mmCIF file of C-alpha atoms and ligand atoms in Angstrom:
data_model
loop_
_atom_site.group_PDB
_atom_site.id
_atom_site.type_symbol
_atom_site.label_atom_id
_atom_site.label_comp_id
_atom_site.label_asym_id
_atom_site.label_seq_id
_atom_site.Cartn_x
_atom_site.Cartn_y
_atom_site.Cartn_z
ATOM 1 C CA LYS A 1 0.001 -0.011 0.000
ATOM 2 C CA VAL A 2 1.207 3.456 -0.892
ATOM 3 C CA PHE A 3 -0.085 5.820 1.797
ATOM 4 C CA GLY A 4 -1.080 9.387 1.352
ATOM 5 C CA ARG A 5 0.982 11.760 3.487
ATOM 6 C CA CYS A 6 -1.915 12.742 5.798
ATOM 7 C CA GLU A 7 -3.281 9.204 5.767
ATOM 8 C CA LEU A 8 0.045 7.949 7.066
ATOM 9 C CA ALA A 9 0.275 10.771 9.600
ATOM 10 C CA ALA A 10 -3.150 9.777 10.921
ATOM 11 C CA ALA A 11 -2.247 6.086 11.159
ATOM 12 C CA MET A 12 1.060 6.887 12.871
ATOM 13 C CA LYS A 13 -0.741 9.094 15.366
ATOM 14 C CA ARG A 14 -3.381 6.460 16.153
ATOM 15 C CA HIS A 15 -0.574 3.959 16.773
ATOM 16 C CA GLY A 16 1.115 6.338 19.285
ATOM 17 C CA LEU A 17 4.148 7.672 17.404
ATOM 18 C CA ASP A 18 3.377 11.390 17.852
ATOM 19 C CA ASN A 19 6.025 12.485 20.356
ATOM 20 C CA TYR A 20 7.161 8.931 21.018
ATOM 21 C CA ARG A 21 10.592 9.215 22.681
ATOM 22 C CA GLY A 22 10.170 12.951 22.097
ATOM 23 C CA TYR A 23 9.900 12.775 18.312
ATOM 24 C CA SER A 24 7.031 14.814 16.882
ATOM 25 C CA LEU A 25 4.817 13.224 14.225
ATOM 26 C CA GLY A 26 6.461 15.186 11.376
ATOM 27 C CA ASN A 27 9.781 13.458 12.141
ATOM 28 C CA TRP A 28 8.143 10.060 11.586
ATOM 29 C CA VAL A 29 6.354 11.163 8.406
ATOM 30 C CA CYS A 30 9.569 12.717 7.006
ATOM 31 C CA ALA A 31 11.486 9.503 7.796
ATOM 32 C CA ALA A 32 8.881 7.379 6.015
ATOM 33 C CA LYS A 33 8.903 9.672 3.000
ATOM 34 C CA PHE A 34 12.644 9.308 2.438
ATOM 35 C CA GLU A 35 12.902 5.691 3.541
ATOM 36 C CA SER A 36 10.073 4.212 1.452
ATOM 37 C CA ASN A 37 8.147 7.026 -0.329
ATOM 38 C CA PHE A 38 5.222 5.934 1.907
ATOM 39 C CA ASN A 39 5.185 2.451 0.297
ATOM 40 C CA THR A 40 4.636 -0.419 2.742
ATOM 41 C CA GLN A 41 6.051 -2.895 0.184
ATOM 42 C CA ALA A 42 9.450 -1.166 -0.164
ATOM 43 C CA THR A 43 12.501 -3.464 0.194
ATOM 44 C CA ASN A 44 16.167 -2.636 -0.248
ATOM 45 C CA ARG A 45 19.262 -4.842 0.014
ATOM 46 C CA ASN A 46 22.125 -3.558 2.139
ATOM 47 C CA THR A 47 25.810 -4.067 1.274
ATOM 48 C CA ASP A 48 26.256 -6.467 4.216
ATOM 49 C CA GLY A 49 23.566 -8.854 2.833
ATOM 50 C CA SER A 50 20.829 -7.718 5.171
ATOM 51 C CA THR A 51 17.603 -6.188 3.813
ATOM 52 C CA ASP A 52 15.476 -3.162 4.856
ATOM 53 C CA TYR A 53 11.692 -3.697 4.887
ATOM 54 C CA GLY A 54 8.572 -1.565 4.793
ATOM 55 C CA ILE A 55 7.511 1.996 5.343
ATOM 56 C CA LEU A 56 10.397 2.631 7.773
ATOM 57 C CA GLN A 57 12.950 0.326 6.117
ATOM 58 C CA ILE A 58 13.594 -1.810 9.180
ATOM 59 C CA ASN A 59 16.752 -3.906 8.873
ATOM 60 C CA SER A 60 16.987 -7.734 9.086
ATOM 61 C CA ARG A 61 20.484 -7.445 10.654
ATOM 62 C CA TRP A 62 18.864 -6.786 14.044
ATOM 63 C CA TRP A 63 15.121 -6.424 14.004
ATOM 64 C CA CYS A 64 13.270 -9.049 11.986
ATOM 65 C CA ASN A 65 13.816 -12.518 10.587
ATOM 66 C CA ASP A 66 14.027 -13.032 6.847
ATOM 67 C CA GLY A 67 15.890 -16.355 6.885
ATOM 68 C CA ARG A 68 18.769 -15.033 4.785
ATOM 69 C CA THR A 69 20.808 -12.691 7.019
ATOM 70 C CA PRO A 70 23.509 -14.824 8.672
ATOM 71 C CA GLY A 71 24.372 -14.083 12.278
ATOM 72 C CA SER A 72 21.550 -11.555 12.532
ATOM 73 C CA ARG A 73 18.998 -11.074 15.308
ATOM 74 C CA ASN A 74 15.213 -10.744 15.410
ATOM 75 C CA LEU A 75 14.679 -8.222 18.230
ATOM 76 C CA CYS A 76 11.106 -7.365 17.194
ATOM 77 C CA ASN A 77 10.274 -11.067 17.089
ATOM 78 C CA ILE A 78 8.609 -10.883 13.661
ATOM 79 C CA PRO A 79 9.102 -12.164 10.131
ATOM 80 C CA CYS A 80 10.391 -9.322 7.983
ATOM 81 C CA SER A 81 7.412 -9.880 5.659
ATOM 82 C CA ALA A 82 5.120 -8.598 8.502
ATOM 83 C CA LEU A 83 6.759 -5.218 7.864
ATOM 84 C CA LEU A 84 5.344 -5.090 4.297
ATOM 85 C CA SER A 85 1.670 -5.270 5.300
ATOM 86 C CA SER A 86 -0.929 -2.610 4.387
ATOM 87 C CA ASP A 87 -1.465 -2.461 8.159
ATOM 88 C CA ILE A 88 1.408 -0.576 9.770
ATOM 89 C CA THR A 89 1.057 -2.076 13.264
ATOM 90 C CA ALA A 90 4.154 -4.268 13.085
ATOM 91 C CA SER A 91 6.341 -1.498 11.610
ATOM 92 C CA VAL A 92 5.209 0.964 14.267
ATOM 93 C CA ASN A 93 5.730 -1.454 17.164
ATOM 94 C CA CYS A 94 9.186 -2.358 15.923
ATOM 95 C CA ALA A 95 10.057 1.328 15.246
ATOM 96 C CA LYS A 96 9.225 2.030 18.907
ATOM 97 C CA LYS A 97 11.863 -0.547 19.948
ATOM 98 C CA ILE A 98 14.446 0.855 17.487
ATOM 99 C CA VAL A 99 14.017 4.477 18.536
ATOM 100 C CA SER A 100 14.379 3.455 22.215
ATOM 101 C CA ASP A 101 17.748 1.692 21.549
ATOM 102 C CA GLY A 102 19.978 4.675 22.541
ATOM 103 C CA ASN A 103 20.509 6.534 19.239
ATOM 104 C CA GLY A 104 16.970 7.862 18.914
ATOM 105 C CA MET A 105 15.949 8.448 15.299
ATOM 106 C CA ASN A 106 19.608 8.558 14.187
ATOM 107 C CA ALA A 107 19.080 4.813 13.662
ATOM 108 C CA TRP A 108 17.438 5.894 10.415
ATOM 109 C CA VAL A 109 20.263 7.307 8.301
ATOM 110 C CA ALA A 110 17.753 9.037 5.927
ATOM 111 C CA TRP A 111 16.189 10.775 8.920
ATOM 112 C CA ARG A 112 19.590 12.043 10.112
ATOM 113 C CA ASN A 113 20.588 13.199 6.607
ATOM 114 C CA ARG A 114 17.264 14.579 5.322
ATOM 115 C CA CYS A 115 14.921 15.314 8.209
ATOM 116 C CA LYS A 116 16.966 16.095 11.320
ATOM 117 C CA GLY A 117 17.051 19.813 11.995
ATOM 118 C CA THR A 118 14.636 20.681 9.185
ATOM 119 C CA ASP A 119 11.104 22.072 9.483
ATOM 120 C CA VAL A 120 9.549 18.623 9.906
ATOM 121 C CA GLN A 121 6.184 20.107 10.911
ATOM 122 C CA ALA A 122 5.684 20.809 7.189
ATOM 123 C CA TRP A 123 5.120 17.045 6.760
ATOM 124 C CA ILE A 124 1.846 17.149 8.704
ATOM 125 C CA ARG A 125 0.667 20.599 7.540
ATOM 126 C CA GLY A 126 -2.948 20.443 6.323
ATOM 127 C CA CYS A 127 -3.774 17.087 7.933
ATOM 128 C CA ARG A 128 -6.859 16.566 10.109
ATOM 129 C CA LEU A 129 -4.994 15.089 13.072
HETATM 130 CL CL1 LIG B 1 4.605 13.815 -0.169
HETATM 131 CL CL1 LIG B 2 5.944 17.746 13.640
HETATM 132 CL CL1 LIG B 3 18.545 -15.032 9.075
HETATM 133 CL CL1 LIG B 4 9.998 -15.703 11.367
HETATM 134 CL CL1 LIG B 5 16.634 11.106 21.418
HETATM 135 NA NA1 LIG B 6 17.424 -11.105 11.328
HETATM 136 RH RH1 LIG B 7 1.031 16.387 17.412
HETATM 137 RH RH1 LIG B 8 1.874 16.081 19.898
HETATM 138 RH RH1 LIG B 9 24.882 -0.243 4.981
HETATM 139 RH RH1 LIG B 10 -4.986 -2.481 12.138
HETATM 140 RH RH1 LIG B 11 -4.101 0.114 10.962
HETATM 141 RH RH1 LIG B 12 6.836 25.445 8.932
#
């Protein structure tokens, strides 16, 4: 599913991401934009052989099992395919664990490079939230 910007903002809010670990909703929407272009089916292979899955491009190296990432962990206790669902529950729940890991949203390199420090509120402008 390719979400609309405000549609995704609303789903993220309902699932408790607005101000989660201090990160306003626009931070999450901006991260999703640059990670996946709001596409829940997005996948991308990393150089180390791991793969990033879903709207927030969660990595199989640590967070989910895809059966093909040697030596990796599955800290969200989910198949990586769960992260590709039209329903964002699994991605949100796992994102909450990631952002709590010590590094905050710096865990998402696209957030650090493209969202951090910018006017992220723009990403939720106009939405009925
Ligand atoms: Cl957009
Ligand atoms: Cl915001
Ligand atoms: Cl594996
Ligand atoms: Cl599994
Ligand atoms: Cl933080
Ligand atoms: Na894994
Ligand atoms: Rh808010
Ligand atoms: Rh708020
Ligand atoms: Rh890499
Ligand atoms: Rh649901
Ligand atoms: Rh839902
Ligand atoms: Rh502004």
